[PDB]
């Protein structure tokens, strides 16, 4: 069914005889020649150390946030690392993740009992999912948590860690609030799983097109114009001819767009 146009015609009609006429048998396609990867040429490694290896985390009633920006975050050393008992990614696949680009990736860090880390989920209402750390419905981002009994647990009980239990309506996702409202923990090395302190970090990012700043560790390649090429701009992939354009963009916008929601113009990241 690809030897010559006549044999292709026979295959389309499912016959060994073809009557006189004109037949539509296939579709002509030009194939892409090479690949184009264009990422911003920032090179600073990313300070995940000061988040993951912090000496003492914050307590979940007043969970922390750190800005991650202007870094080329190699997420592989995270996913390759074995200490994480729970690396769960929503709306993004962890192996594919390393090639993408982000505009605001946020690290939230707080310590909770190892038993209830399941309540770190988009729904799953509970004493900490409502009054302490409400996780928004259906976001994109990975929740990475680990055991901390070696570090944050005191013989005779560790009471530095507090979680709010309160008597009103839960307010909003991603909002911290500052009978008595604050309950101490009882972290002890004698305590096994359950009542066991787990250190939790949730990386929340957006994966939408805007000028990016936290990209993957992918080397850029020179860009070739006026020929069918397979391009990759900041995680945007496709096939097409790249030409110079007179479309007047504005600093807050990088991506043009078509009526049918396909991309129509890109801004060269460099």
């Amino acid at each position: 069914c690809a030897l010559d146009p006549l044999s292709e015609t026979k295959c389309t009609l499912k016959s060994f005889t073809v009557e006189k006429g004109i037949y539509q048998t296939s579709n002509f396609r030009v194939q892409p020649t090479e690949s184009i990867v264009r990422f911003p040429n920032i090179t600073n490694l990313c300070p995940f150390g000061e988040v993951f290896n912090a000496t003492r985390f914050a307590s979940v009633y007043a969970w922390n946030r750190k800005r991650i920006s202007n870094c080329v975050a190699d997420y592989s050393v995270l996913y390759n690392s074995a200490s994480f008992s729970t690396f769960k990614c929503y709306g993004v696949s962890p192996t594919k993740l390393n090639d993408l680009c982000f505009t605001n990736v946020y690290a939230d860090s707080f310590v909770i009992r190892g038993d209830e880390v399941r309540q770190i989920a988009p729904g799953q209402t509970g004493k900490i999912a409502d009054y302490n750390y409400k996780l928004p419905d259906d976001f994109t981002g990975c929740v990475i948590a680990w055991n901390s009994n070696n570090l944050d647990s005191k013989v005779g009980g560790n009471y530095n860690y507090l979680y709010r239990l309160f008597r009103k309506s839960n307010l909003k996702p991603f909002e911290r609030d500052i009978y008595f409202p604050l309950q101490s923990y009882g972290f002890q090395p004698t305590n096994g799983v359950g009542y066991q302190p787990y250190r939790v970090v949730v990386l929340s990012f957006e994966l939408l097109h805007a000028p990016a700043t936290v990209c993957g560790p992918k080397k850029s390649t020179n860009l070739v114009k006026n020929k069918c090429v397979n391009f990759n701009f900041n995680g945007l992939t496709g096939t097409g001819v790249l030409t110079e354009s007179n479309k007047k963009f504005l600093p807050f916008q990088q991506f043009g767009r078509d009526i049918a929601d396909t991309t129509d113009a890109v801004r060269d990241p460099q």
């Epitope: 000061e50 290896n53 000496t55 070696n150 570090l151 005191k154 013989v155 005779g156 530095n160 090395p189």
Partner: antibody, heavy 120, light 106 residues
Framework: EVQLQQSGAELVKPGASVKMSCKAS????????ITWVKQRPGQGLEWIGD????????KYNEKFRSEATLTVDTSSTTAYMQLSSLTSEDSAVYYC?????????????WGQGTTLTVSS | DIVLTQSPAILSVSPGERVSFSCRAS??????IHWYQQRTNGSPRLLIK???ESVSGIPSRFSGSGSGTDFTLSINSVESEDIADYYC?????????FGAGTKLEL
């Protein structure tokens, strides 16, 4: 009284390792961490690693990822640092120290100054 | 990794007159900073518990200021009794680091 005592002094030909020890006294050995540091005459201090005496855990500096190994004995209320494959660049002054991880994260108690002389 | 650099390499000093040190890191630490001094024998002692406030065990002659990246130490009145070198140090995230060293001399 709250104080950390030091092992003493060694004269050692290069190649032969040293076991070093840190006599804790006068405090709750199970609620304070232990931290080891080393410096050289005319040079500043460098951290090597820490141990939680209450329950087994350890953190190490990368520049001493294999040379230093740290251990503790709660019953004797003492900590130990072992150095392997000593060199003339290991001729250094070592201080044991107390670290209050759960407290203010400070080096509130130290040794009296241990000088390790390595001579070929 | 955090790098802690001390700008005043050497200050020539005379007793009584005001002298001030500063510490410049590579990035934000928060407020978990300490200072240690080394008499010529080599025994350290605590001076600054947290970056801004003096520890309860030190006279109020010593005070700290700044947070995050710019840190400073001031001497209210210097004397030969206070001949010492000050090390900037941080303990917020592993690994624990130390300073470079600043000297006092007549």
């Amino acid at each position: 009284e709250v104080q950390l005592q030091q092992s003493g002094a060694e004269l050692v030909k290069p190649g032969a390792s040293v076991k070093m020890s840190c006599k804790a006294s006068g405090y709750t050995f199970t609620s304070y961490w232990i931290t080891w540091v080393k410096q050289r005459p005319g040079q500043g201090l460098e951290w090597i690693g820490d141990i939680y005496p209450g329950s087994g855990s350890t953190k190490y500096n990368e520049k001493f990822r294999s040379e230093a190994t740290l251990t503790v004995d709660t019953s004797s209320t003492t900590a130990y640092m072992q150095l392997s494959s000593l060199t003339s660049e290991d001729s250094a002054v070592y201080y044991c120290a107390r670290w209050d991880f759960y407290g203010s994260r400070t080096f509130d108690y130290w040794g009296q100054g241990t000088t390790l002389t390595v001579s070929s | 990794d955090i790098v802690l650099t001390q700008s005043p390499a050497i200050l020539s000093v005379s007793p009584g007159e005001r002298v001030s040190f500063s510490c410049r890191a590579s990035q934000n630490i928060g407020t978990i900073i300490h200072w240690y001094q080394q008499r010529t024998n080599g025994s350290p002692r605590l001076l600054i518990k947290y970056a801004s406030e003096s520890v309860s065990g030190i006279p109020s002659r010593f005070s700290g200021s700044g947070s995050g990246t710019d840190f400073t130490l001031s001497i209210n009145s210097v004397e030969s009794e206070d001949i010492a070198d000050y090390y900037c140090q941080q303990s917020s995230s592993w690994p624990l680091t130390f300073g470079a060293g600043t000297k006092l001399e007549l």
